[PDB]
Paper text:
Here, we identify two O-methyltransferases from tea plant: CsFAOMT1 that has a specific O-methyltransferase activity on the 3ʹʹ-position of EGCG to generate EGCG3′′Me, and CsFAOMT2 that predominantly catalyzes the formation of EGCG4″Me. To explain the specificity of CsFAOMT1 and CsFAOMT2, we crystallized both in the presence of EGCG and S-adenosyl-L-homocysteine (SAH), a by-product of the cofactor SAM and determined the structures at a resolution of 2.0 Å for CsFAOMT1 and 2.0 Å for CsFAOMT2. The electron densities for SAH and Mg2+ are unambiguously assigned, but EGCG was not found in either structure. The structural overlap of the monomers of CsFAOMT1 and CsFAOMT2 revealed a root mean square deviation of 0.36 Å over the Cα atom of 190 aligned residues, with the most striking difference occurring in an α-helix (α9) near the substrate binding pocket.
In vitro, enzymatic assays with recombinant CsFAOMT2 protein confirmed that CsFAOMT2 has mainly 4″-O-methyltransferase activity on EGCG and a lower 3″- O-methyltransferase activity. In CsFAOMT1, this α-helix is bent toward the pocket, creating a deep and narrow cleft for substrate binding, whereas in CsFAOMT2 the corresponding α-helix is bent in the opposite direction, resulting in a relatively open and shallow pocket. Two sequence variable residues were identified subsequently: CsFAOMT1-L50 (CsFAOMT2-M50) and CsFAOMT1-Y184 (CsFAOMT2-R184). Consistently, CsFAOMT2-R184Y led to significant increase of 3″-methylation activity and moderate decrease of the ability to methylate the 4″-position of EGCG, and the 3″- and 4″-O-methylation activities of CsFAOMT2-R184Y were decreased by 58% and 54% when M50L mutation was combined in CsFAOMT2, respectively. However, in CsFAOMT2, this residue is mutated to a hydrophobic valine (V49), which makes it possible to accommodate 5″-OMe and leads to the production of dimethyl EGCG. Notably, the side chains of arginine are known to be more flexible than those of tyrosine, meaning that EGCG may bind in a more dynamic manner at the active site of CsFAOMT2 and CsFAOMT1-Y184R mutant, thus conferring them 3″- and 4″-O-methylation activity. The Km values, 95.79 μM for CsFAOMT1 and 20.88 μM for CsFAOMT2, indicated that CsFAOMT2 has a stronger affinity to EGCG than CsFAOMT1. In addition, the kcat/Km value of CsFAOMT2 (6762.45 s−1 M−1) was higher than that of CsFAOMT1 (3830.57 s−1 M−1), suggesting that CsFAOMT2 has higher catalytic efficiency. Additionally, two trace amounts of di-methylated EGCG products (EGCGdi-Me1 and EGCGdi-Me2) were observed in the reaction solution and further validated by LC–MS/MS analysis. Moreover, 3′,5′-dimethyl ether (syringetin) and 3′,4′-dimethyl ether were obtained with myricetin as substrate, which means that CsFAOMT2 could modify myricetin on all the 3′-, 4′-, and 5′-positions of the B ring.
Residue numbers in the entry: 8 to 138, 143 to 236
Write the structure that this text describes.
Amino acid sequence: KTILKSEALQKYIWDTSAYPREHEQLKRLRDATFKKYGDRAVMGVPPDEGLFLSMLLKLMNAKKTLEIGVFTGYSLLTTALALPHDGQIVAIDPNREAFEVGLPCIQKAGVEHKINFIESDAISILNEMLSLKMEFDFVLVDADKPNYINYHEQAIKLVKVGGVIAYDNTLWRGLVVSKEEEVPERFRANQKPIIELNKHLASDPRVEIAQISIGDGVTLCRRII
Ligand SMILES: Nc1ncnc2c1ncn2[C@@H]1O[C@H](CSCC[C@H](N)C(=O)O)[C@@H](O)[C@H]1O
Ligand SMILES: [Mg+2]
């Protein structure tokens, strides 16, 4: 899976620059995910995106973060490894089984303590958090795309001024543009909420944005008010 010119170019990045710098337990988590879910493992954050997130977290001096959507935990383990010793992550996903695929790797890496995994749909947890308000340096959104705009309007209140909200899938499979037509039910579930998110973020004066053509598309939003 890639949004790049060729599969060979994507593999070149991984072979040259990501795999040689990838923590052993991140590799093991990827392999466990492929073994369990087969081609569904595509849903996970890929290794070049992971190494990018890791550097971003360090450059930002992030310490407290929020993850909306976890799956088997590739981005979660990436984040826990990148944060300082006193880092803490709140990570929300209704699928505890998927989390438990990655958990042994998280544990062997020694970073389980940095993670508060919450088995829930995210909206209800975020609503409760917004009902002292918790504050985060960084938020990663990689979950159910029809809710991404709704997550933005909660996350913009939970991230600190100067902090970052990152959205995965903002160039979803390269299919946000297409010469072919998509069928209504699939369009409404996938391309449409991303096309709409992208307009929403571009129009939001409360953030600065940078859409990055890495992974499945990552849009960084820096909160300015
Ligand atoms: N309402 C909801 N709230 C939080 N997570 C949800 C959700 N609906 C679906 N999801 C989750 O979003 C996930 C998307 S895949 C997340 C990928 C992950 N960041 C990685 O690196 O592997 C699935 O695990 C799914 O359970
Ligand atoms: Mg997703």
